[PDB]
Structure formats: structure tokens, C-alpha cells
Design an enzyme around this catalytic site. Structure first.
Site, mmCIF file in Angstrom:
data_model
loop_
_atom_site.group_PDB
_atom_site.id
_atom_site.type_symbol
_atom_site.label_atom_id
_atom_site.label_comp_id
_atom_site.label_asym_id
_atom_site.label_seq_id
_atom_site.Cartn_x
_atom_site.Cartn_y
_atom_site.Cartn_z
ATOM 1 N N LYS A 196 0.834 -1.206 0.000
ATOM 2 C CA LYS A 196 0.000 0.000 0.000
ATOM 3 C C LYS A 196 0.873 1.262 0.000
ATOM 4 O O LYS A 196 2.059 1.173 0.292
ATOM 5 C CB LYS A 196 -0.937 -0.014 1.214
ATOM 6 C CG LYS A 196 -2.310 -0.606 0.922
ATOM 7 C CD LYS A 196 -2.525 -1.898 1.697
ATOM 8 C CE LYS A 196 -3.794 -1.841 2.504
ATOM 9 N NZ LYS A 196 -3.603 -0.951 3.681
ATOM 10 N N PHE A 255 -16.979 2.513 5.758
ATOM 11 C CA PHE A 255 -15.965 3.462 5.299
ATOM 12 C C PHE A 255 -15.293 2.974 4.015
ATOM 13 O O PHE A 255 -14.289 2.260 4.048
ATOM 14 C CB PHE A 255 -14.932 3.745 6.398
ATOM 15 C CG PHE A 255 -14.540 5.198 6.515
ATOM 16 C CD1 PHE A 255 -15.385 6.210 6.058
ATOM 17 C CD2 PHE A 255 -13.323 5.555 7.090
ATOM 18 C CE1 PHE A 255 -15.020 7.553 6.170
ATOM 19 C CE2 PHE A 255 -12.949 6.894 7.206
ATOM 20 C CZ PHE A 255 -13.800 7.894 6.745
ATOM 21 N N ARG A 281 -0.754 -14.469 4.114
ATOM 22 C CA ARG A 281 -1.575 -13.874 5.147
ATOM 23 C C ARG A 281 -0.884 -14.004 6.487
ATOM 24 O O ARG A 281 -0.924 -13.080 7.292
ATOM 25 C CB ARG A 281 -2.951 -14.526 5.178
ATOM 26 C CG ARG A 281 -4.026 -13.623 4.624
ATOM 27 C CD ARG A 281 -5.233 -14.358 4.124
ATOM 28 N NE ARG A 281 -6.360 -14.202 5.032
ATOM 29 C CZ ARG A 281 -6.787 -15.149 5.854
ATOM 30 N NH1 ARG A 281 -6.178 -16.331 5.890
ATOM 31 N NH2 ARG A 281 -7.828 -14.916 6.640
ATOM 32 N N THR A 332 -5.676 -8.172 10.347
ATOM 33 C CA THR A 332 -6.068 -6.883 9.772
ATOM 34 C C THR A 332 -5.596 -5.745 10.660
ATOM 35 O O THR A 332 -4.959 -4.796 10.189
ATOM 36 C CB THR A 332 -7.608 -6.787 9.572
ATOM 37 O OG1 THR A 332 -8.165 -8.086 9.308
ATOM 38 C CG2 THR A 332 -7.909 -5.981 8.319
ATOM 39 N N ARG A 362 2.780 -6.554 9.541
ATOM 40 C CA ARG A 362 1.864 -5.653 10.235
ATOM 41 C C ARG A 362 2.143 -5.532 11.734
ATOM 42 O O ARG A 362 1.900 -4.476 12.332
ATOM 43 C CB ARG A 362 0.424 -6.102 10.022
ATOM 44 C CG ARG A 362 -0.032 -6.033 8.570
ATOM 45 C CD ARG A 362 -1.464 -5.613 8.396
ATOM 46 N NE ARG A 362 -1.885 -5.805 7.018
ATOM 47 C CZ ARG A 362 -3.011 -6.411 6.657
ATOM 48 N NH1 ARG A 362 -3.840 -6.897 7.576
ATOM 49 N NH2 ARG A 362 -3.305 -6.541 5.370
ATOM 50 N N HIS A 394 -1.403 -5.463 1.426
ATOM 51 C CA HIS A 394 -2.593 -6.252 1.209
ATOM 52 C C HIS A 394 -2.169 -7.678 0.877
ATOM 53 O O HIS A 394 -1.202 -7.889 0.153
ATOM 54 C CB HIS A 394 -3.425 -5.664 0.060
ATOM 55 C CG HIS A 394 -4.413 -6.628 -0.503
ATOM 56 N ND1 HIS A 394 -5.696 -6.745 -0.010
ATOM 57 C CD2 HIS A 394 -4.292 -7.570 -1.466
ATOM 58 C CE1 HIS A 394 -6.334 -7.695 -0.672
ATOM 59 N NE2 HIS A 394 -5.503 -8.214 -1.559
#
Lengths: 149, 149, 149, 149, 149, 149
Positions: A9, A57, A85, A91, A102, A115
């Protein structure tokens, strides 16, 4: 073999994590078969996040990624989707375990740098939307003998 | 102190993960007391699986191992066996957590780069078959003061 | 191909630079063919530093490296001797360039973590004294195709 | 923003993990706002460890940390206390997950290199005892745009 | 032992290079004895840059560094001043060698992340202006046995 | 800003140095504006090494390249061409300094993992042949404030 779509991203690129993220995937024994940098259309993104068109959103999300730079990728290898993943994490980067991208680099779900495809069915759709077939390059991985059977 | 047998399998040395694996073990505060590179005798490698022979894939392993290079090691330190296994991860690198060697570098159970002793009893037996007593080097770790009691 | 003798001195092992050093050699595209940990006899060392018997502080040097642990290695590859010396740096870690092992990790010539062979003639002598021929393991480096020729 | 007190204990400084620790916190997207090196006085340590007055060995705890060097820090950022705890790991480095500081570098709970605040309320108390308000430096993090909302 | 003043400039802190820089100095076998984060007051900055008074752009110099955050440090060890300069690189990051901080991370002389003292005499002056004597912490480095004579 | 063409050759992709190479360029403060993976055409390849026709090894490089995968890139930033060359090293990885890609990873001139443009004039020609204008992505580097004027 199993392919997955991994996309750095804008915030990933801004923070200079492109190299680091790729290194993580390479070291896993995975096979990079497609990579491109693009400012994605609000119409390419409309189709990528068709699954998530069902989220409160959304009007903020599409315009966002369309602006900043994006590094789109396809990686190939056994259990590619799940392990990608796994490498990425949950997330929410707060509940995401240490060792993951992450969980090592992110704080907020709006800015989670990467992503990863959620399922193999989701992956095959995502690859087709982001890449041309011509783009996916075929090469023999010399190392695959010592990673696989 | 507690000793365990860690062995970088062929695929580990081919992928150039010898240094990285060792560094992982050193940075944990553990003590390398024996290391050697050899092509393991089919004969002497046979006793390494003498306890697990009741497995479908037995003949294929005593082939892919004996031919390829192997780095045999003994590491010493508090709770060495369990922590080594912790550092390595689960048998299957798909279910193995990120942060571990097998969860960072491997995809398939046939090629998971490293072996670790499963118990203290298993360790002592494996050390004996792989190394001579003279091979295990005695040295005072200067840093042990700051890692242990 | 050209072989060189690389030995991590006791201070190298103490400071936990074994993994790091190997990693540097591995990433260069070089081939580890022999590795052993030993407390070197004063007689094995008496001959290793025979050429270096032409130094004021000798009676204190052999005793030193005799005590602490040592990781002896042989590495194979094109221009192995020179390039190993390059990776290591100058004798004096103060005049040694950054990027090298000695220039990244050492301060004093008495504690320079590593030894590298000075010439091809010196290397072949050094290997014979430290290793048995049986110790040197023969393996096909899969990645040699993409490093060489 | 949420502030937490992170302190590299003496064994952390001894083992040269200061840079490494900080890097881990930097890469997470957190904001260092205060740092200092000190040999902590009984006075500070008695207040910092007030809860542990109901333990047999307390006079030596305020005496160990009182001896060795300590690097005291304050870090700022969303969910700082919990994430710091997460980055650090469990109290016992044997049960703490790999990827964490304690799970990557430590073996014994007596020597686990770092302290992290356990609660927000604990944090604010800890910050006040270790640092003066003048020491907490105010600066605009340029990158916070790309880590936060 | 020889002391030098090393200061991570604001752009170093902004880019999250604090840990990285420290690690580089740690790994070299050097001794951190003082560290502090501050927004340098005009007074300090006028005395630190007293030799740059006879220069056209001086008011913007002291106002740039007086703005952004700064991590002030003192490091101790054999040939500290020279080797610090060596680890840092030339003033212009374009002519500075790779392996160095400035040659690895910087492009412009205006933003070269770090300051290092240019001479021993300059260092002792710099230390006095930035730190109080109480701030310089005395501790025994356990590992100095294995770095020094 | 000044743009240069950097291309990870087949041997670079096979050895899994894509991530590491990219990270090296990112950490220098440079801006990735184009990246793609392809198996390069004869027609495309021949014009790339057009000036190297009056050279003994002209046909054979087209053999070990076209078959293998390549990662073509464009990076932008101050003094991009020379710095890229600096980051890469000399043609021959034996004579190339440590710290460089070729001096850290390569042994033979036939397999030196990466290409870098030799001059600005050669860069602008190379970019044109390898990428379409649409491919070069325009983005504001948020960190450019802290790397440049």
C-alpha cells in the site's frame, strides 16, 4: 503452483518498506513472478475491493490508495495464500503477532502497509484485475529443489 | 548444562542459511560447543530415524540427506532442547509460527532446513551418534554471567 | 576451485559473531566445505603461526588462541584467498575500511576476531594443518550456476 | 498521545542490545520523546519498585540495577503501553513468543534486558519518577501522517 | 579512555535511524556512556557551532537544529574520535564511502543525519557544552576484555 | 530529478537478492518510480548492449539473460546515476569494494546480479527502451523534505 496477490500500500512505499517486505517473502522460499509500480485507477480499485464494497468506510478508501504509489505483486508457491496472510498478520496491527509485517511495522488498520489475498478464489480474481497474463513471467526457480519435493 | 543436537539439513546449506541459523542461536544467548560439516554415512544416518522408521516416507529421506551437505551442531544452555524446538518451529512450516526458522524460511515438510532434538533423552542419544566426546569443546562463556544466574 | 582457511578467533566466538561472519561469506556466493570447533593444541598452532614466528609478541599469542574456543573453516570459490582477505579487512582494524568484518566489529590488532589466509600457498598449508582430507566435504552447490560462468 | 516507559536494563546494555531494541521500536512507527543513560539511585529505584517491597529479595534488586548502566526511555504513540508489552514479550523469556525482544534474546527472568510499563496508570507514574517534564521533548513526527489517521 | 561526541541530527531521528546508528557503534565494540534527547537551546547551539559564526548562513543553522529533535551522545573507547569519523564518513555523503552511515543513508550535506567530533580537542569541548559531568555514567564493560588488551 | 536504470539480472533473482538490493536503494533515500518483472526479448536486449558489440563476450550474455527472469527498475534522486554505480560497485566484483552489492554478493563478472547505468545520457536511453512513459509513476515522496533541500 498456488499464486497470491500481494500489494504494498502507499504507506508501505512511503516508509521505505518495499525492499524489506520483498526480502521477507524471498527468504520464505517463495517465487516472485510479477511486480509493478502504478498509481491505481479508482476503477481498478473499484473492482479489487468489490468484496469490501460492503463496508461503512469505503468513500475514503478508494481515493486514498489511488493517490499514493502502490507496488503490486504476484508470488507463487505451496500454500501461497495462507502463508502470505501469515507473513502479513491480522487486519488490525495491534492484535497482529510479532514477526509479521503488520505486527513489526504497523499501528493502525487504515495504514497497514500491505494487502494479501484472503482466499485462493479471491487471489485468482485479484491477479486478473491487476495484471495482464503477459505480465506474469515464467521462470524456473533453481532453488525450488531445496524448498519443495 | 542442557545440550541439544541441531543439524542444518542439505536444503539449509544450499539456500545459504547456515550463518543466519547460527546467528539466531547465538543471539538467544546459547553456547555453541560443537560444529562439523559432513556427508552423513547412509549407515550412520540410518540410526537417526531408528525410532521413527514406522513412517511411509523413510527411504527417500536417507537419500536426500546422505548426498547433500549437512552441518551438525551441539548447543548448550538452559532449557536448550525446548527452546531450540521453539526457535525452529513446528514440523510443518505452514503451521509453524512466524519468527521461527521454519516459519521464516520453509514451505514443505520434506525441506525444512533444520533438525532439532525433540526431548532431552533424544538429544543425548543424537549427540553420541553424531559426535565424539573429544569433539565437544569445553570453553567458559564470558557472557553467561549476563544471560544466566 | 580456490580454497582459503578462515578461522574465527576466540574473541569472535565470545562476542557471538560466528553466525554474522558466516552469513557475510555465504552472501558473497562462497562455498563452505569444512567447519569445526576446537580448542587448538599449542602444537597445531605452533605450526599455523610458524611464518609469523617473526614477531616480537609470539610467546603470548599461541597461549591465547589455545585457551579460548576457535571455529576453523574452509571456504571455496573463485579468488577465494584475496576476497576473504577483502571481506576481513586489514590487520589493524583502525586502518581497515568500513564494510569489512574487522572494520565493522574490531578495535585492536590483538583482538581482530578472524584469521584469513594471506596467499594461496599459505592457504593450502593452513588447510592441511587444521583439517583432515576426510573433513573437507564434497557437495554440488546448486546456486554456482548463477554466481559463476 | 499514549506514553509508555521503556527501560533497557543493565544486561541489555552489556550485551549491546541498545540499538537493536530502539530499532525495533522505531520500525513499529513509534515516537521516541525522551532517552537518558544513568546509574539509578536507590531513591528512584525504591519508588519504581514500590510494589515489590513484599518480596524476600528486594535489597539486592534495588542494588543490581543500581550498579549496572540503564537506558531510560519514553515512547509515544497509539496503544503504546500494550504494544510495548507485546514487543517485549512475557516476563519469563521461556514462555515469551519468538519475534519479541525477550523471546529473541533472553533466557532467564532475572536477566530479561528490558522493562515495559504494564498499564497506562503504571506508565504515567513511571515516567514522572524517571524523567523531569523538561526532559520530555516535543517534536512533530513527519511520518505520523503515514502511520496514523 | 578516549571520548567522542556523537549527535544524531533531526533528520536522523525523523528517518528512524537512531537504533541503526547506535547498533553500528555498539557492534564496533564501543562504550556508550551518555545519551540524551533534547531540542537544543540557542545557547548550546551557538557554542557548538562557534567556529561557524563567520559564515553567511548561521542563524538558519541554529534554528534548524533548535527546531527538530536531537539525540546527543558520548561514546568511549580506543581511538574513539577517528573511528567515529570513519563510521560516519566524509561530510559530503556523495564522496563518502559505502559502509558508512552517511554513505549508506544520506545524499545531501545539509541533511547528513549525524555529527561526529573532528579532533580529540574538539571532542572534549563538545562533551562539556552538551553534557554535565553527572550525566556521563561510569560502568564496567564486561566485554572490554575481549575487545581490548 | 536525475533518473537511472537499475536492473537485477537473472542471477540476482535466482539468489533471492531482489528485496535486499531494493532495501539498499531505499535506505539511501532514493525514489523508486518504476519496477517490472519480465523475460527480456532478443529485440529489446540487443539494443541495450548495442555499444558493447565490439566486445568478445556479446552473444553469450544474451543466452544466460533472456532465459532468466529480470527485475527492471527506474530510481530517481540527486546524483542518481553515479550513486547507483557507487552502490553497485565496479564491473569485476573482485576489484569492487566491500559495502557494495557486487562486493558483498558477487564473484565473477559474468554473474554480477545487477546492472546500473554508466552515464546520465546512457540512463535516459535505457529507461526509454525498457519502460513506457505511462509506466514511470509520479508520486510525492513525503520524506524528500528530510533527505534533500
Amino acid at each position: 503452483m498456488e499464486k497470491s496477490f500481494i500489494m504494498i500500500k502507499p504507506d508501505g512505499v512511503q516508509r521505505g518498506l518495499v525492499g524489506t517486505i520483498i526480502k521477507r517473502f524471498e527468504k520464505k522460499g517463495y517465487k516472485l513472478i510479477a511486480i509493478k509500480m502504478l498509481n491505481p485507477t479508482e476503477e481498478i480499485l473499484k473492482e479489487h475491493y468489490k468484496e469490501l464494497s460492503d463496508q461503512p468506510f469505503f468513500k475514503n478508501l478508494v481515493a486514498y490508495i489511488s493517490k499514493g504509489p502502490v507496488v503490486a505483486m504476484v508470488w507463487e508457491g505451496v500454500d501461497m495464500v495462507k502463508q502470505g496472510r501469515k507473513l502479513i498478520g491480522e487486519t488490525n496491527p495491534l492484535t497482529s503477532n510479532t514477526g509479521t509485517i503488520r505486527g513489526d511495522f504497523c499501528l493502525e488498520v487504515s495504514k497497514n502497509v500491505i494487502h494479501g489475498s484472503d482466499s485462493v478464489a479471491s487471489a485468482n480474481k485479484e491477479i486478473n484485475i491487476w495484471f495482464k497474463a503477459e505480465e506474469l513471467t515464467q521462470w524456473k526457480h533453481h532453488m525450488k529443489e531445496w524448498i519443495c519435493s
